[PDB]
Design a protein around this ligand. Structure first.
Ligand SMILES: Nc1ncnc2c1ncn2[C@@H]1O[C@H](COP(=O)(O)OP(=O)(O)OP(O)(O)=S)[C@@H](O)[C@H]1O
Ligand SMILES: Nc1ncnc2c1ncn2[C@@H]1O[C@H](COP(=O)(O)OP(=O)(O)OP(O)(O)=S)[C@@H](O)[C@H]1O
Lengths: 398, 204, 194, 398
């Protein structure tokens, strides 16, 4: 009965772990009765010290493992290039849980638990890892290769994964770090120095690696920038540069293998020219596709909810995930027809990108709402016309 | 797709060369601006990636060329340590202006055969700093209500290596003169501090 | 860094040539012109045309100061009117239209200060760039050659140096300025070099 | 009932705003009535302080919201882009509204009635971003990608757009900026330069963003230059560099999507070598082919009004509009016949580029008149001659 639990610790509070532990357990045990978002408090302690306590995948007697995270505040931690070229953004160094990415885990929807797969990846990782398994016999690479066509959330998923792993591993990591590998930065003008300082970068990595209190999160967006090609024409024109620095990056992955705390996140909207080196160092190798119908549905629901919370649609209303829609047998009544036409919106919406999707509601509120206030029953067909436009647009896009 | 740093290095004697022409052009410009000599009779050249005042006084031309090479020498032996240009009145000859340049050299240049990391870029721009600075300095030097002349003082610690025509002389202070310092500049071998002394005004 | 200037005596037309020689001094000390304009009287295409640009600037500046007072003068290098590559502020807020001292005395005092204000300490020889001068003026002075910028604001980056004054006067208001408004040089100066 | 107003303060005015507000609203009190450009006045106050009073989408018992805008003059484009202090590089920097485009939005007509739509996009931007919506639930990447056959107003359109925009949105924006990248900038002889180049580009653009007051317009002209073949099948060296560009470009845009005050106008040719990513973050696609007969007629009317006003054709005449032409339904008289001849022209003018279109009368008068004095509608037959010329010109060259 594993039930992981979130505890948002303020950067403005003063409470500590035991106080908050007792307090939150008292809150639950007071209620102790799907998933809920405990945000309206009765106890003054957490009212002053905690901003959000929710759980995301009806009963009580499950292993309620609380987990306390303090969403920090700093966004950038400038670590410029060691060599030269002042004010060149070498490292974007992201403190752990800091609120940039709060609640962003609710982005994706791929109900095959692809998320959960990637999630408990690192959990099982550390389980095997620090329980005396022989590397020499069984070993992996703490690369993680998300994989899928663009407009899907790959980099976003990387980030959210890091955040959630954070909230989980408080028991074993008081904190950790994310590392925005500015790939295009990594190279150098010169003949050699490029690889030479690839080392330096991975050394800044090793810095964090030493911190057993922390947990390392390499984030190499668009690794092809690192690894151009072993398969081009002989005119590569920077071969002794390109391929060289590439296999250097290979060496660095291969050294960082042996540790037990690092994880490398890697994606490509552009898998075409991926260089066999990574794919053969063969992380989870998680393929992704565009969102599913039900996915579009859930995401539209979330959109509507954020909207009604910011009053942009004034008469706040009720929604129904496909669960209750399917239980009511899709009976055509006034209440249902809202979400039923919504489902139709989705069923014609599939074939598009979640990026464009979460673009839709707002940009439609611009396009066909044409009013500072609007309600559902026209907002919906409005979104419909918007999506029709989107398809005809990609068509005309030639 | 590549490039390469090719750093040349520096020498005792190269430092001497460059700082010699430094003082050449600087003296030219100083004696141009304040009115010490006929300004109209001069012109400009391109040096230090900038524009410089150059004379035509064949007399002073040859004179200062002699001085330049002799200083090149004494730098190549770290011999001199002060370089001053004392400007004074014509007849009563009272000192009005005294540009003191205090010189540091590299004794270890005897063994310092291997070069030192410092660029023509760096040295050049720093002398440009010097030049532009001195130029600016005219903006407050109390103007010369008369015409003037000048004399050239240095200080080589050695009373030893003295060539023929040069004679020993006196310190030539000023009674009521303010001294104001300019930016420093060096070669990692030779540095030269700079500061002008000038007769304090009678009336405010 | 920040540097004011200390004067015992007040002024009126001083302000004019103050800004004039300061501008000049600066445009030289940023390499925009091969020699100080005070000595550019030699050599009589870009050279003379840019110098005449500058002269028109100077002249209309004198016009403007003759018309009304100025609290603050701005001189830009690159960027735009709303953001510089770098800039210099020249405070005249502390002055009213008195003096028996010589204007040249204030000039040389202030410039000796500037030198002791240690400014222009950048080995990094900047390229040849663009220059615009601005300053505030009377709400209704009917200024013609300049042009106001009713939405203007002092940008807050690349603060090379605000040159500020002090003439030794006790304490003045601020409303005498709140009516005034920035104007702008109608034509960008360009600084050439060979 | 929101009727905005194009309050032009001539830079020569020098008077302060509120007085002008008062006087213009009093003008409204006077006339109390289609959309027009009031210049000739009664009170000498406005007569001096104003140079034009225009309004676009009669009636005045509505909510009039004035917009006092003062023009500006100099587009210096001064932008170092100093990779090594030695670079004179292609970054135009236009202070917003200025004589560059004063009166341009007045003319760029479009079949789809794109304008209203694209326009109130950015209007929706504020009023329903600054509701403090959770961005990380609903995003809008600020990256608009028009497109169409070359020479179709596109770059002109985006320019005039931002012009009118910064007009409409004074209160919350002291002013704005236009940064015009010119990819010819971006390339380099050397592998590994371009990335640093792009990073520094948006470094300075980030600078201009930093002020919350201003308003940022990134006027990319030929995005395709960047994103040529990120995902495509030719030789790899040029592709090595090209990838190594576009990757960083994309990452930087995904950064800058974190400020409520930036709009990336983007544009391209046939360009079907476009992309796979700007295709993605194309929050507002827009296909713009050649115009239709209607817009053609409107543009020609504008042309004829120019040629009357500047008295280059002397005997002024009377015209109509398609609406006006339809109130009497194209029925023939020797009064509107001339507009009907223009109509025949348009009916055979379509299939061209508006660029060429507004260039036509220029060309016709240069090539078939040779009389600085010339009667219009003698003008038109030779105009048609030059039209047919243009046709066969394309026919030959293609
Ligand atoms: N299925 C989805 N669910 C939720 N958000 C999505 C989805 N698809 C796209 N998005 C949004 O689109 C953006 C994706 O961010 P990223 O992590 O950079 O995407 P990605 O994985 O990098 O794909 P690319 O390469 O950037 S197009 C975020 O704003 C997400 O919220
Ligand atoms: N529908 C239109 N209405 C008015 N002028 C137009 C129209 N279409 C084109 N033009 C003119 O054609 C020119 C187009 O300028 P741009 O903005 O560069 O055009 P474009 O859409 O960018 O195509 P290119 O290939 O970039 S020039 C301007 O002079 C416009 O005035």
């Amino acid at each position: 009965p594993t039930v992981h639990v979130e505890v948002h610790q303020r950067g403005s509070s003063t409470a500590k772990k035991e106080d908050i532990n007792l307090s939150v357990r008292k809150l639950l045990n007071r209620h102790n009765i799907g998933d809920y978002t405990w945000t309206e408090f009765d106890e003054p302690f957490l009212t002053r010290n905690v901003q959000s306590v929710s759980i995301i995948d009806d009963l009580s007697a499950c292993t309620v493992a609380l987990h306390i995270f303090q969403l920090n505040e700093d966004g950038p931690s400038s670590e410029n290039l060691e060599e030269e070229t002042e004010n060149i953004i070498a490292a974007n160094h992201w403190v752990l849980p800091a609120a940039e990415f709060h609640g962003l885990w609710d982005s994706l929807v791929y109900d095959v638990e692809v998320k959960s797969h990637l999630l408990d990846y690192v959990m099982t990782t550390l389980l095997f890892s620090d329980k005396n398994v022989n590397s020499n016999l069984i070993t992996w690479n703490r690369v993680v290769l998300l994989h899928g066509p663009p407009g899907t959330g790959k980099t976003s998923l990387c980030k959210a994964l890091a955040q959630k792993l954070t909230i989980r591993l408080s028991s074993r990591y008081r904190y950790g770090q994310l590392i925005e590998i500015n790939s295009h930065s990594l190279f150098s003008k010169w003949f050699s120095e490029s690889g030479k300082l690839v080392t330096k970068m991975f050394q800044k990595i090793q810095d964090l690696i030493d911190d057993k209190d922390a947990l390392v999160f390499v984030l190499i967006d668009q690794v092809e920038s690192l690894t151009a090609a072993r398969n081009a024409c002989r005119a590569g024109t920077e071969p002794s540069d390109a391929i060289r620095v590439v296999n250097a990056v290979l060496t660095q992955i291969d050294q960082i293998k042996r540790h037990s705390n690092v994880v490398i996140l890697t994606t490509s909207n552009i898998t075409e020219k991926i260089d066999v080196a990574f794919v053969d160092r063969a992380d989870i190798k998680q393929y992704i596709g565009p969102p599913s119908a039900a996915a579009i549905f859930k995401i539209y629901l979330s959109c509507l909810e954020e909207l009604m919370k910011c009053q942009i649609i004034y008469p706040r209303q009720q929604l129904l995930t496909l669960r209750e829609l399917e239980m009511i047998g899709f009976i055509e009544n006034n209440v249902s027809k809202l979400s039923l036409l919504l489902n139709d919106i989705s069923r014609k919406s599939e074939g598009l990108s979640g990026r464009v999707l979460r673009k839709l509601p707002f940009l439609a509120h611009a396009l066909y709402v044409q009013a500072p206030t609007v309600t559902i029953e026209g907002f919906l067909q409005a979104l419909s016309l918007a999506v029709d436009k989107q398809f005809e647009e990609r068509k005309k896009l030639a | 797709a590549l490039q390469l740093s090719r750093e040349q290095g520096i020498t005792l004697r190269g430092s001497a060369e460059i700082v010699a022409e430094f003082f050449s052009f600087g003296i030219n410009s100083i004696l141009y601006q304040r009115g010490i000599y006929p300004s109209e009779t001069f012109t400009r050249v391109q040096k230090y990636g900038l524009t410089l005042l150059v004379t035509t006084d064949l007399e002073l031309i040859k004179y200062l060329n002699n001085v330049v090479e002799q200083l090149k020498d004494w730098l190549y032996k770290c011999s001199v340590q002060k370089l001053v240009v004392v400007i004074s009145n014509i007849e009563s000859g009272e000192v009005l202006e005294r540009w003191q340049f205090d010189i540091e050299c590299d004794k270890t240049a005897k063994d310092d055969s291997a070069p030192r990391e410092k660029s023509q870029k760096a040295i050049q721009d720093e002398i440009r700093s010097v030049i532009r600075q001195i130029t600016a300095t005219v903006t407050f030097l109390p103007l010369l209500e008369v015409s003037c002349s000048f004399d050239l003082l240095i200080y080589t610690d050695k009373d030893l290596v003295v060539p023929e025509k040069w004679e020993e002389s006196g310190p030539q202070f000023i009674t009521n003169s303010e001294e104001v310092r300019l930016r420093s500049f060096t070669t990692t071998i030779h540095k030269v501090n700079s500061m002008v002394a000038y007769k304090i005004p009678v009336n405010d | 860094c920040m540097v004011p200037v200390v004067f015992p005596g007040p002024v009126q037309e001083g302000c004019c040539q103050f800004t004039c020689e300061l501008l000049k001094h600066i445009m030289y000390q940023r390499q925009q012109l091969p020699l100080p304009y005070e000595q550019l009287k030699h050599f009589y295409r870009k050279c003379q045309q840019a110098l005449a640009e500058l002269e028109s600037v100077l002249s209309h500046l004198e016009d403007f100061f003759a018309r009304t007072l100025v609290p603050r003068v701005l001189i830009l290098l690159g960027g735009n009117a709303l953001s510089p590559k770098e800039f210099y502020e020249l405070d005249l807020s502390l002055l009213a239209p008195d003096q028996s001292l010589s204007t040249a005395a204030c000039l040389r005092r202030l410039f000796r200060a500037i030198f002791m204000a240690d400014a222009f300490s950048e080995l990094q020889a900047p390229p040849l760039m663009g220059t615009v001068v601005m300053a505030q003026g009377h709400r209704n002075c009917g200024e013609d050659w300049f042009r106001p910028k009713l939405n203007y604001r002092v940008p807050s980056r690349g603060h090379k140096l605000t040159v500020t004054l002090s003439c030794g006067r006790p304490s003045i208001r601020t409303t005498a300025w709140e009516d005034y408004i920035w104007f702008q040089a109608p034509v960008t100066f360009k600084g050439f070099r060979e």
